[PDB]
Structures are given as C-alpha cells and as structure tokens.
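Q: Structure for this?
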Amino acid sequence: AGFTDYKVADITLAAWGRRELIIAESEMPALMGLRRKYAGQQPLKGAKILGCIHMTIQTGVLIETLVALGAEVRWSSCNIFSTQDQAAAAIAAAGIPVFAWKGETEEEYEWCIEQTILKDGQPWDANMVLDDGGDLTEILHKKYPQMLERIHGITEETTTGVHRLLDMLKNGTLKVPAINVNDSVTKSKNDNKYGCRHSLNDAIKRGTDHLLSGKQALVIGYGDVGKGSSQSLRQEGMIVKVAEVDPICAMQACMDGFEVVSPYKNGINDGTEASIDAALLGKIDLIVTTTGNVNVCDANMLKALKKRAVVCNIGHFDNEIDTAFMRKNWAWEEVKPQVHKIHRTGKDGFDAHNDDYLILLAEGRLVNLGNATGHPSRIMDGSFANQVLAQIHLFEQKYADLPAAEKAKRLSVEVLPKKLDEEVALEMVKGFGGVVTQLTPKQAEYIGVSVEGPFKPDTYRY
Amino acid sequence: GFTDYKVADITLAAWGRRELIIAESEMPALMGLRRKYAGQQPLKGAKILGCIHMTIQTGVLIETLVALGAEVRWSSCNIFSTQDQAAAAIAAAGIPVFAWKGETEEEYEWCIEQTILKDGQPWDANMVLDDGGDLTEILHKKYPQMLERIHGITEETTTGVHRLLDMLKNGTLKVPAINVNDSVTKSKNDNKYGCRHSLNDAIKRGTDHLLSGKQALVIGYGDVGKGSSQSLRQEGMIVKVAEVDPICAMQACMDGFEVVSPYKNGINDGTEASIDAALLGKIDLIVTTTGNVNVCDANMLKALKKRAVVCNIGHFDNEIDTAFMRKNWAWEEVKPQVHKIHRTGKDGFDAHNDDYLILLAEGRLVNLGNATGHPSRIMDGSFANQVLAQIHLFEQKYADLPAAEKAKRLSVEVLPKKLDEEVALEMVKGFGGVVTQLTPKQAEYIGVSVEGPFKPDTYRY
Amino acid sequence: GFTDYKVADITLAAWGRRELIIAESEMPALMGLRRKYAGQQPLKGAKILGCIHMTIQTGVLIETLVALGAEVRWSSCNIFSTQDQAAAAIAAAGIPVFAWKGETEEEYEWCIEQTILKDGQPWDANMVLDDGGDLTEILHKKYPQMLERIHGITEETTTGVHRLLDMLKNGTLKVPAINVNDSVTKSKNDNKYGCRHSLNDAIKRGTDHLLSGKQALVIGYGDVGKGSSQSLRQEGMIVKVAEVDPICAMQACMDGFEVVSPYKNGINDGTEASIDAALLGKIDLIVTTTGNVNVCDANMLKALKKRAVVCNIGHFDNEIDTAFMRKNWAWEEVKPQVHKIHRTGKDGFDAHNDDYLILLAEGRLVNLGNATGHPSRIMDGSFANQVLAQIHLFEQKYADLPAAEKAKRLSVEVLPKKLDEEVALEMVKGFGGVVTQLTPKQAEYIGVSVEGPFKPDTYRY
Amino acid sequence: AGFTDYKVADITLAAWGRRELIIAESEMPALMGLRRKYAGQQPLKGAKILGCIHMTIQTGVLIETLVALGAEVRWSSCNIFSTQDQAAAAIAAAGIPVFAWKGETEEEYEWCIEQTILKDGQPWDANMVLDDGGDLTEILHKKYPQMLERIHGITEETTTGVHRLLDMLKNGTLKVPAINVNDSVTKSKNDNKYGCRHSLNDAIKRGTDHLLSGKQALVIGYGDVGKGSSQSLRQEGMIVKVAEVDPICAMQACMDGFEVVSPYKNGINDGTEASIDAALLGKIDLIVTTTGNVNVCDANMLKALKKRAVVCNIGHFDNEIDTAFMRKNWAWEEVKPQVHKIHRTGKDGFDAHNDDYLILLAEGRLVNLGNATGHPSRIMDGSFANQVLAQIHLFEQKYADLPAAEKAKRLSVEVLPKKLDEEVALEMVKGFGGVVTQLTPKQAEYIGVSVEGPFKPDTYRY
Ligand SMILES: NC(=O)c1ccc[n+]([C@@H]2O[C@H](COP(=O)([O-])OP(=O)(O)OC[C@H]3O[C@@H](n4cnc5c(N)ncnc54)[C@H](O)[C@@H]3O)[C@@H](O)[C@H]2O)c1
Ligand SMILES: NC(=O)c1ccc[n+]([C@@H]2O[C@H](COP(=O)([O-])OP(=O)(O)OC[C@H]3O[C@@H](n4cnc5c(N)ncnc54)[C@H](O)[C@@H]3O)[C@@H](O)[C@H]2O)c1
Ligand SMILES: NC(=O)c1ccc[n+]([C@@H]2O[C@H](COP(=O)([O-])OP(=O)(O)OC[C@H]3O[C@@H](n4cnc5c(N)ncnc54)[C@H](O)[C@@H]3O)[C@@H](O)[C@H]2O)c1
Ligand SMILES: NC(=O)c1ccc[n+]([C@@H]2O[C@H](COP(=O)([O-])OP(=O)(O)OC[C@H]3O[C@@H](n4cnc5c(N)ncnc54)[C@H](O)[C@@H]3O)[C@@H](O)[C@H]2O)c1
Ligand SMILES: Nc1ncnc2[nH]cnc12
Ligand SMILES: Nc1ncnc2[nH]cnc12
Ligand SMILES: [K+]
Ligand SMILES: [K+]
Ligand SMILES: [K+]
Ligand SMILES: [K+]
C-alpha cells in the first residue's frame, strides 16, 4: 500500500519473480527447514540487517527467510551485473527495501549501497551486516564508523571478503565480530566448486553459444573456484590447461588429469612481452581467471592470445584481467549486453569484418552471474543456510552491547561449528533422496564419535 | 655371509633391483631428498624399526633412510602386501627385512618380532616408522622398556593416526609422533588418487571381470572412498555410495553418485528385517573403505546378489564379517587371494554351484593384496613426508629431554605446510608441470611470500 | 523498399549480423564452400524452397546458398526454433523469410505457404531443402504440380529421411532426394554432439536446476539419445536409459548406464498396473529422443515424481502425450516455453501446490525451444553437407528428364564418403588438428588411396 | 592319461583353469544360452574345426560351446604371447587337441598351427575353420591347398583377418566362403572398442605399475581399437593426443575432447629426421599403436620419444612399431617377461643405471593379451556367440559338397544378419540385468519395423 522504499528496473516483473521463488523454495530444503523450525520462535525479532549480495532469485529466498524469522532488512547487490531483475522486483513487491538492477553503473552501485545504509536521509539503525565481497563492510568502516557501534556482527559470504576481514583483524581495524561463512564445507566445497562447475559453461554458452568440445582452455588458478571451473570445461570436452602458483593445488591439477602450464616462460613474470609463452597463448581458445589475485591475465597475455579467444573472470573482482589496458588501446564492439568484441587493430573505430578481436564476457566481472544466473538454487541452499545460522548466532551474542573490555576479548573471525555444517549437509542430502547410514553404538565407539556427530576432527579436509 | 633376514626367495633380488631402479625415476621428491641430505647424513645414529607394506616403493623409502645414515629393521604391516622381489632386493643389499607375500598371522607376528629382537635381545632402536599402528602397539604392550630409547613414531595411515590419538587422549602414548597421513601430499594424494589407480587394478587381476555396466556399492566416502568410487565410475560402473557422515554424503551426491544405505532408512537393528534386500540383490561389487568395524556385516553378505565380488580397501579386514563366512560357508580357492564362498553350507560344495560370493584377499587391503598397491609416483609424496618426519623427530631427541620438556612435546603433530608445498613442487615437476611465480605486487596483494606458504593452515584444498 | 518477408522485429537485424559474422569464423567447412564455389556460381538458376529452424546457423547456410547463385524463400520447421535476430538479419539482406519464435500452428503453416506462393501464385521453385519432411509433405499433397519443376529434395534430419523412404517404398515420391542426415559429419556429429552441447544448455536456461546428483530417464539411445545421455551424465546426473533396440541398449550398458523400462518386464499393456511406479517416482528429469510416438505416455506422466522436469528433443512433439495433459491438468506459464502442469486437476490451480511437473517448450524440440540449438561449429558439418547436396541434385536437372529416365534416377541416396571426408578435414583443421598423410607403402598396405576414401562404405565409425 | 595329442606349458595347471572356466561361464550368457538352446539338436555334429585364436579362458568357453554342439576341434593360439597357460591346460585335460603356451618362439608358433592341421602326420579331415588374423587361412591356402577342398567355410574374428580375406576374394585366391564376424555390432563396437578400454590400461599397469594420471599419451589411430584405447587412458587421467589419417575419425576425436596431432610436421612423413615433431614426441610418456597398418611408430619417432617413454602396440601385428630397428641398434634389458628396457645408448651392452631408455611391452605384440588377459569374459561373450552362429551357418550350408555352379554363387565374405546381431545383444543386456522395452503395435507401425525387429535398416551405423 504505497510502498516506495526501493529501486529496481521494472516492478512489473514481480509476478514472474514470485513464480521462480516458489520454485526455488522446492530446490532449497535446508533453507526452508530453517524457516519451519524457527518461524515460531522469531530468533531474528529485532535484527535490522544491511545486506549486500547478488540480488538473484536465490538471494530472494535467503531474504524472505531472514524476514520470516523476524528480521528487517535493507538490500543491495554486490555486483553491477549480478541482479536478476525479476527477483529484485518480487522482493520490492513484497515490501522489502531493495536497490538493485542488472547493468548498473559504478556510480549507481555505490548509490544503491547507500540507500540501504540511509533511510529518509539519515543512518538506519542497523545492527547486523550480511556481505559478499567486503564492499559494504568497507563503506561502513571507512565512511560510517559510528554505525558499526550499533552493529553485532558481519556474516561474510565469499573468499575475497574473508581475506579483507582477516587483514582488518590483523591491522586492528575490524570493529565488529564476523563469521566466515565461506569456510563451511557446505559452502566452500559446495558453492565455490560445484557451483562454478554448473554455471561457468552455462554463462559461456549463453554469451557466445560457442562449441567448447575439442577446443583449448587455460584456467588461471586451481583453488575451489578453479577446480570447478576446470571441471565445467573439461566435462564439455575442452582440452584444459591449468596455471597455479601454489604447488599443492598444482599437484591436484596434475592428478586430476590436467597439464599444468604457466603463461610466462619458466613461470617468470618479469613484465616483458618476451616472458610470455607466445606459442602457448596463441593456441588458447578460452581463458578463465579464478584467483582472487590482481592482474593474472595481463596486457601482454591479452596481446598474445589466439585471435577470437574468449576472455572471462569468475573470481570476485574484475581486476584479475587488465581490462583497463584494453579500454585504453582497443576498440570495443558490443555484440549484446555483457558480450564485447575487442578489436586489437587499434583504438579509433574498427572494421566490422576484422578477424583480430577478442570476446570479453561481462566486462571482466564475475562471469557466471554476469552472463547467466550464477549458481543454482539447490547449491545456494547450503551457503544460505550457513548465512541464516550465522546471523542468528551473532545477533544472539549482542556484541554491540558489551563494555569496551568485553568487546576486545570478543572481537574475532570465526566459522560455524562442524555440527551445524553437518546438519546443513544432511538436509541437502535428503533433498537428493540420499539415505545416510546411522552408526551402531559399537561402531561409534570404535571410531570415537557420537552417533549424532560430529563425525570428523576439526582438522579434516574432506 | 649375511643371514639376518627372511624372505620367500632371494633369487628374485635381481628382478627387484631392476624394479627399484625404475621406481627411483618415478619418485623425484624422494630421490631429491636422498640427494639433498646424503651429504649431511642427518639420520646417522638412527635405528629405525619399520613396519609398512614391503613393496617396491617401500624399498625406495628404505634405501633413502639408509643413504641418510640410518640403520633399519623392517617388516610388512600386512600378510598379503609384500612384493617378494622387493623383499629379496632389500635383503640382498644387507638390510634386515622379514617379509613375504602370503604369511600366516603367526608368521606376521614373528616377522615384527624379528625387527624388534636382534640376536635374542631387544635391538637399541631409537625411531619407529609405522603403517597402521601394529608395531606401535606391540612396543607399548610387550616391550615398553624399549620406548625409553625411542625418539618418536612417524605413522603413515589414517587408522594408525586414529590409534595414536586414542592413546594420547588416554595418557598411554609414551613417545611423540608425526601424523604423516594428514599432509596434503599424502592424504589427498595417496589416500584418494592411490586407490583410484589401484582398486580397479586389483579387481581386474583377481577376477578379470568386466566392470562397465555393472552395479557397485562403496561403503564410505572419505579419501579412500572418494578415490575408490572414481576407480569404478571411470570404468563405467554404476556406483552407489553409503556414508554415515552427511558432509561426505553431500560430496558423493554432487559428484554424481546415488547415496544409499544397506539398511532401511539407514537404521541397523541387527536383524535381517532391516536389510534392504532389494538394494543388495542388485549389487555386483561391494567395497569397504571406512576404517570402521563390521560395515559389510553378515546379513548384508546373506542378501548380496549371487556371484557378487566382496573386497575391502581399508586398513583392517574386520570391515567385513569374514569370521561369519568362515563359520558357515565353504571356501573354494580360485587362485591365491581369490576365494569363492559357497553359501550353500559349511561341509563341502558343488563345483558348479551358482550361489557363491567372490572374496578378494580374504578381506585384507585388496589393492595391495591382489595387485601392487599405489604406483611409485603417488607413493613418492607419502614417502618424502616420511623422511622429513623421521629427520625431524630424530633431531628432537625426545628420549633425552628432562621430564618437564617431555610433557611439552608429547603430542601428535603434522608436517608444516611449507614442507608439504616443497614435496608438491617436486611432484609437479615430475609431470613436467610449470608453476607460476607470483610477482612482488601480487604476493603483497594476497598477503603471502613469493616463496609461500600460499594458504592459511585452515585451508582444505 | 523490400517487403517480401515477415519477422518478429526487423530492428534486430544489426544484432543478427554481428552474430552471423561471429558464426562465420565458427564454420570453416561452410565458408570454405563459398570460397571454392562462389566463382563458379553452381546454384545459378536455383530457386530453393527452404524449411529449417531459422537460427544464426541457418542464416549462414542461407547466405552461402545465395553466394553460390541461388534464390531462396525460407521458413522454419518448428514454431519455437527461430532466433528472431537471425530472421531479422536475413530479411534485412533482401531474402524472403517467414519465421518468428513462438508461432501458432496456424502461423506455422501460413509461413510455409508464403515460401511456396509468391504474389499469390506458385513460385517457380526447382529445389527443396527440408528438415523434418513438412515442406515435402505439403508439396506432394497440396501442390503436386510444383514438383514437376523440382529437381530434388535435400533432407536434414532422421525423421524426414524416414518419411522420404516411406514414399519411395510406396511409389509416391515425385522427385529424388539426398539423405543429408546419414553423412557421418552429420549424424555422428550434429545428432550426437549437438545434443550433448545443447540439451543441458536448454534445461539450464529453462529451469536453472542443478543437475548433479539428480535422477534422469532418457528414452532412446540412438544418436540423439547418446548425445543427450552424455549431456546429462557429464553434469553429474544419474542417468537411466530406455531402449527397444537391444544393440543400442548394449551400448548404453557398456557406456556405463543402467538400462530400464518404464514398464514391468518392458511390456507396455496400456494400464497403470504396467507402470514401474517405483522407478518413475524416483525420476527427476525425463527426455524423449526416439522419433517415435507416445514414448512418454499418460500413465508415465501420472507416475512421475512430483516436480519432475519433462522434455523432448526428438523432432516432433507427439513423443510426449501432451494432449492428455492439456485435457486433464491446469497449466501455469512460468515464462515463455516453461510450464508447470498441475496434476491436481483442470479447474485452476493453487499457486503453492507441490504436485506439478515442469514441461519445456510445450514438448517441442527442447534444445531449440529453450536455448539456441546446436552451436555454429557443429552445424558447420550439417550445412556443408546440405550445400553440397544442393549442388549434386541441381546439376542433375532431374525435372528435365523423360519419365523412363526419371524412373531410373528416382532414389534416396547419401553423399559419397569422399565428400564426407572432405567436410571432416575442414572441421578438423578448424580445431587446429593435424591429420597425418599415409606413405605410398602404408596406403598400399591397407589398400586405400593416399587421398582416401579411407574406409569401405560398410564402415560404422 | 592315454591321450597325448596336445602341447601346453604345464598340464597341472588344468584344475585352476577349470575353475576360471566355470566363473567365465557365468560371465557369458549369450555363449551359454547358445549352449543350452542347441546342445540337443547337435548342429555341429560332424564338423571338424581348425581353430587359431588366442588360447585364453574366453576361448576355452568358446571351444567348449562348439564341442558341446557336436564338433571336434584342433586348436592353436594366433599369437606367441596371448595364451593363458591354465586355459590351454584345462582344454587339453578335457581331451581336446590344443598346441599353445605363453612365450612361444616364431618357429614354435608355426609348429603349433601345423599340429592342428596334421594328425598322425597326415592332414586332418577338417571341414571348418575359425581364425583370428588370417594366419591359419594363409597356411591352408599356401601350403595345404588340397585340404580346402573339404572345408565349408572360414569364420574370421578380427579386422586384419577380414582385410586379408577381402583381398584374396578380389584376387580370386580365396577358395572357400567366409563369415566376417568382426563386423557384427556386438563384435566390432563391443569387443574392439570396449574390450580395449578394459584391457589396455590393465596391461600397462601389470607391466610397469606406472601411474598414468597427469602423464602425456599419444594414440596412433582412432578406429574402434583407437577409440577404446584413448578412452582407456583418458579415464585414468592421462592427457591424450590422437593421430589419424582418416579425417572423419579425427573429427570424432576432436569432438570427443582430444587434441589431434601428427608425429610429422604438417602430417608429412617423408622419412627424414627433419620431418619429426621433436617437440611433440619429446613430451610423450606413452605411445600406443591401434592401426592395423605398418610402421606407424617408426625409427625416427622412436629416436625422438621422451626418455623412459612406454611403447606398446594393441593392433594385431607387431609391425606397427619398428622393433627390428631397435633390435639392430639398441640394447634390450629384460625387466621381467614381456617387459624390456631398450637402451638408446647403443647395441653392445648398457649401463644398468642408464636413464636414456624406452620401455617396450610385449615386444610390440598385442599388449592387452601379452601383458594381461585381453578382453573380459562378458565382452568376448558377444564376439564368441557370433562365432558360434557363424560356424553353424557355414557348416550347415555345406559349401564343399555343392556343385561347382552353386559354389561360384556362394563364394563370398558375408556378415551375420542384423536379427542375429540383435539377439546376441539381448542376451548381453540381460546379463547386465537391463530391461529392453517392447514396442506396441502402433509404435512398431509408426517407425515401420516389426515388434520382433530388426529395428534398424542395414545402413545404420549405431
Ligand atoms: N563467481 C562465483 O560464483 C564465485 C564463488 C565463490 C568464490 N568466488 C571468488 O573466486 C575467487 C577465488 O576463490 P576460491 O574460493 O577459489 O579461492 P582459493 O584460495 O581457494 O583459490 C584461488 C587460487 O588462485 C591461485 N592463484 C593466485 N594467484 C595466482 C596467479 N598469479 N596465477 C595462478 N594462480 C594463482 C592461488 O594459489 C589459489 O589456489 C575469489 O575472488 C572468490 O571470492 C566466486
Ligand atoms: N588401501 C590403501 O591403499 C589405503 C590407503 C590409505 C588409507 N587406507 C585406509 O582406508 C581407511 C579409510 O581411510 P580414509 O583416509 O579414507 O579415512 P576417512 O576418515 O577420510 O574416511 C572414512 C570414511 O568412512 C565413513 N564411514 C565410517 N563408518 C561408516 C559406515 N559404517 N558406513 C559408511 N561410511 C562409514 C566415515 O564417515 C569417513 O568418511 C583407513 O583404514 C585407512 O588407513 C588404505
Ligand atoms: N533436436 C535436435 O537437434 C535433433 C537432431 C537430430 C535429430 N533429431 C531427431 O531426434 C529423433 C531421433 O534421431 P536419431 O538420429 O537419434 O534417430 P535414431 O534412429 O538413431 O534413434 C532413435 C532411437 O529410439 C529408440 N526407440 C524407438 N522407440 C522407442 C521406444 N518406444 N522406447 C525406447 N526407445 C525407443 C530406437 O530403438 C532408436 O535407437 C528424430 O526425430 C530426429 O529427427 C533431433
Ligand atoms: N588387441 C585387441 O584385442 C584387438 C581387438 C580388435 C582388433 N584388433 C586389431 O587392432 C587393429 C585395428 O582394428 P580396428 O578394428 O580398430 O580397425 P579400424 O579400421 O576401425 O581402425 C584403424 C585406424 O587406423 C587408422 N590409421 C591407419 N594408418 C594410420 C596412420 N599411419 N596414422 C594414424 N592412424 C592411422 C585408420 O584411419 C583407422 O581409422 C587391427 O589390427 C585389428 O585386427 C586388436
Ligand atoms: N545465484 C547466486 N545467488 C547469490 N549469490 C551467488 N553467488 C554465486 N551464485 C549466486
Ligand atoms: N580374452 C580374449 N580371448 C580371445 N580373443 C581375444 N581377443 C582379445 N581378447 C581376447
Ligand atoms: K541461478
Ligand atoms: K605399486
Ligand atoms: K546455436
Ligand atoms: K580376460
């Protein structure tokens, strides 16, 4: 009834959005179980959550779970290209403040985050933070420190965001306790790997409709994202090569059946054209960055690529690829939104029939969300169940109400306990129809565990 | 006139040496350590009791320890795992070894006894290398005095580590130990990729069965279960996975496996009634990978599809209720380590009976029992970790510390990540892989040294 | 001012031409044909009625036929397969095209008639390019006189080749045809690898469902069933395969699939009691690939697990008994070409009902309906064969022969192996593959020319 | 006892052989189905079959199906290394003439074939021939042409053997009709492909116990054996490159996710050291030949292979590899039977620790049979049910008794009808517990087939 506290691309997409949310709910049994077990207890009664994460249909089920458990929220997306407009619209239509649309400008992105922080032109009395990448965390610490005084914690979604949180902690600049949601196994070894397995080839097909089978790929990185990216491409029949700086991850790539190569002769990146292994890069049809590092597909690499190669990044930020070099030197031709040919013939214009171009997806931004719809609902079930648990926990601990001395002892970056990790997994497994075996008392004795778990020591790597 | 050994057949030594020479080219991390430290002789003074599968790969581990100055006395940690030509080759070089493929339990206990006793008295051992904890166990139970001279234990495998931790918890562990299993260049290399290579290998050698198109059930989805499922799936088996750990079960689903229990609703009540007879009646092959007890029990064995293959790839045979099969069913030996278990009864059997199971390696570790275990280039990582672990604890000299300092170091520890990385680098180079070096700006960006380590200790890979 | 066409949106031409220029770089066999033949204008005088999915790939084919001298009038062979930016680009180049995504059945037949009729009279067509046999059928039945001027038909797909042979068998085929489907660079490329690429693509775009860990049932294991099963298995689906052909079933077993039937003992007696309700109740996704009628029937649909996805990738939508569902169940459009079918009845539905199926593309070709069909680099094979077949038959001038000579020329044939190999060579070079040339001695050894053909006509690849 | 008409390695191996035959019977339901359906009618009564094919456990079941149908046989192996000594022994212990053992010499090999052809010094009154590779066919036509007057047919198992029959037919030198067993679908596209998938990596593991994952393989040829060989290595995690002279098979390898390469620069094999791709071959850890052609792993390739590469051939004849060159120039070190280190440092002796060697399996003979046991029972079931049906047909046609005018009409090389092919596959499928669906009349009518089949036109490629 006269709700206006939102900004989306097209409110008339709400019904489409509601139809997809009702479907996603059937794909997210851990989340919906959290709704059922906790709705009547309202464990988030009083929570006022600032949320900054891809405004997908999946995020929308996360949002309505938080709201169903009593929280108020104000929401923005953490990438300019990751929002699904029908999901944004549906969340707005439900009366939840949201500021998000696919294809924002950098200025619009920053404006959207401020709309969650500011209500009626002043700071919202927020007390919780949910983040994916650290951008909202950053603007709170740098621009609105007084707001953190009233905030109980941050539940942080992804690898890069966690890295920034730990840097602040080691520098004494983190102001509130955080939960590392990324490092739950039902997140990092679910979302980060299998999710990219599902969505990377999906995004490339939608952007280019390129045949992948029999073509040559180079994946930069073999962490969780690189593992699943490599799989996404190999299961399509690509000849996949992997680069790494970490010899352990490189060992895994070898054992998984990949050839480990470096873009630089002898792996030495001295900044010269001559250090590029030009013979290797001239063979590559597709390069994907997965590192969370800076400039791992650099300007010389881009100069050396096979004509018409595809270039994309599935790490969290776009600075994995020297796209700025490309804007400075090469003419860009939009094929369609989030697909650009970059003509290496020069800056001022281009020949429509030039064969010396590259195809860049989503302008170097996260490609699975930029050119497709990111991870599927049933994978995001695990990540977003971890989020809800982390919110309940930090909100219950009321860090913001401690004396300065208790705050000091209490400031930390923690992970969810294994028992909760295990319980999230059980619901995911049940979602597939899987049937977990129950230990007998003698067996639980024999391996020194409780029949209900945990089943592994905290040191276990899975 | 060297006689301080017992093997099946010394004339196999030349064959074993030829195979040892090949393995050294397949093991760059291990050989790199042999070359790096031979000059220092960092194990000079060490007297290592070793108990681990006497394979060609173990032979390269053994000669490395010796090249770094150690004395050793060796046995196998399993009655079926020895490669007789590896055993022979070692003995022929004057290294005390007591091992043959096909031992009895009584012979197995004697072989360990021979490493412990020298000329009828306890050898002045000061180090232990163990796979599974059997040698750790006999020392603590029958020769506790010897542990006063021992500086530590380097334990190879999951089951062994678990056993060390239980002693630690209970206050019964007498010397410190390194958990070699949990290096990433071991657990996520040996335990997974090793079983991927060697499980289907062993099934083919024992039965020469086609695997494609048939139904498998793998009990467990830890590192050995993940690897074992892949061994079968890549051959075209339709693989189902059983697990008690929901996180591991979640991985199995995501990896494209159906997760099932042998019991209805996953609840074992010890009766035939709780068996999923319909599930088990369709299973062509069952593989135990758990390190737990009785995970292929008697009722399961009664319900299995006629002519199913039964085997275990965890450390100990009690994963399968073979005792029950020995009590009630007649065993027909096909060839060594391959038995038909005729479910028609105890006294005798019909040569053409169709109601049998096939048991590989009488339920012992099947990859070692029916083939040669892991390939040299995988063991390379495990055994380089072992050497580094031996060098560490030998240099600590725990047995010479005063009590209060002993109390500080009485623990089960893992190798530092820097070392784990260094082993991995040598392995990657073995494949011709090329690792990229970080630039100074890039290393500053992700907060690591250009030289590593590259991940926090929490990282799971 | 060119007005002889009808498309969804002519202002999409520029986007279509960008995608056409990209797709030319993905189609070396086809663009090679422009180069070898555009100087000789072998299709000069050709007037081709073309009816095939109006995609970016069809656009490149279309423009290649024109570059070699042909006039064309074009429609699509499916109501949902058109890409509108392609139709727009072709229109804007001055080529008669009648096609948009989401036509009705009435509009579909209208669109075909606008190719046949020009200024309200029969076009003076002399060639046919068809995919599925719909254009062919309307000529023989409604405009038989136009065939007296037509030299031949080049038919794209398995279903249409079957219809042609039905006519050749009955003596009702009026002009000769090339069976383009049965080129190896077509059937074993397009039918198989095209569906591998494009089936999971279309399901992702339709539903965004995770496929890993879910249960699929693929009906059929011909070339489309092979590709589709791989499309799902490589995503981590647990795939079951149904077949009526024991040879194709044997391949599915050997490929690592469990072969099952929707019916007990495989006997479809038309009753609910014949349905394997346990199997169907576990299936998360069902895919029809047979080219047969009603292989996903009403009782299977009643028995499917709640929220199962239902789709067909065979040429014609009668593979699925959608008429049953239209008669008995309420349909909720999720978005275009995605429908929840609420099995609670016909009189409306509950928005939060859980007993529904999801139908893609209303049972029409799902890869073209919910994505974009095969990728350019695969269609390259198919469409090089099409172009070559057009030259073959046009240079043959069958319509100018006397009846007694027509009789001897009236057939359904495939391209000679040599052309098949030439297309394949160009496809291989597109990947950067390097074919090895035989030595004269080697060629003599195996009994072939150094230039090929390399296999006897009986060879199955 | 009393019966002495055989020569095997060790007769005491008979009991172990019998045990493996009994197992194999349960793995071969088509063969044992044939045995049950026809033992009563005795369709092979009076047949006298010269058999020449790898004396494995699988061949033993085949031999005993024929005997069970009324035939007498006299048997040798078609390869010097392929016999299973316990199978040979079990067969001779059953009272069946067999002349076969693992590790024959060339002189001994032809002696064994001769011992099947002669009984008591005079030619045996044979009247049927079962061959694998055409060697038996070749000795009969060259050296005992009179015996062919009494012989009703040849049933030929393999591609090389079929090629040789067609060339004799074209030349007018083939004296009796033949059935091409290789080209049943339940043979070619089962045995030739899936058989090698099972048995290639099997043989390499038994010979060397080498890790295959992460290493570089080069497969020469991508026919049925090539397709199966490549899959055998790739499923182990090898990085596999494929070479081919047929562009259609090369197109399949690309789409199958393989890089297609040639050992020669630009594919051009002109016999020069300069034509070799030294860079490529210096990266190859394993080369497998699958072609049925001659010298496809030649001297210069052997010179250029990466130190310690493994070299093996899975084609029928060992001349795919230039082993004669290696015998002439390099020193062979036997690791164990059928495993040789070939020291490229010279011919006269070697350094025991030389690093510059190749590993040659089975001395270049069929590696799956030389170093392991060839195909598994359940695959050979398809090949060998075809063989039995083929024998029944040609023995019943009584070609050798027909008038000359009818001989000329029936002198051909034929394949089995598709209906029998389908019936073989049905038994196979059933052996896996697969359930084949029955068409309804309406459906049968709609695709124009009978409900009983055949279900495909003869042009169908599967
Ligand atoms: N798009 C998505 O849906 C999604 C999902 C999860 C995470 N992510 C993001 O992806 C990135 C990687 O995440 P992760 O979980 O895989 O982290 P990770 O630490 O597990 O792996 C990144 C890897 O990159 C390697 N690397 C770093 N610099 C390199 C260089 N110069 N060359 C080659 N390799 C190099 C590191 O050794 C490391 O193994 C992060 O930005 C994370 O936030 C994206
Ligand atoms: N054969 C070999 O070469 C080899 C190599 C390494 C380790 N191992 C042995 O294999 C065993 C497993 O080792 P791991 O490293 O995989 O250990 P792990 O802890 O990683 O895996 C064991 C798994 O079994 C599961 N499990 C336990 N009881 C179960 C039950 N009743 N039903 C189903 N699943 C059950 C656990 O949840 C766990 O995931 C140990 O005995 C280990 O020492 C053998
Ligand atoms: N969508 C696409 O892009 C595309 C591409 C090529 C062909 N097609 C179409 O797909 C269909 C199949 O083509 P194909 O080349 O694979 O034909 P095919 O003859 O190779 O295979 C069809 C298979 O279905 C099996 N089958 C028939 N009735 C069955 C039943 N009731 N139950 C189970 N299995 C049954 C047959 O035994 C046969 O093996 C045809 O309509 C063809 O025109 C579609
Ligand atoms: N070891 C086994 O168990 C087994 C089983 C079946 C057949 N075979 C034998 O293996 C061989 C191959 O049989 P197949 O059925 O695959 O035959 P095939 O005709 O289908 O395949 C052989 C392939 O080799 C290719 N080729 C020829 N010369 C080449 C060259 N110089 N470089 C690269 N590729 C080249 C051909 O193009 C062809 O595709 C024959 O000798 C056959 O009898 C062995
Ligand atoms: N679909 C999705 N929704 C939210 N965050 C995501 N991160 C990756 N995929 C995502
Ligand atoms: N096991 C086997 N027996 C007979 N012939 C074969 N050809 C390939 N493998 C074989
Ligand atoms: K999604
Ligand atoms: K080994
Ligand atoms: K397309
Ligand atoms: K065999």
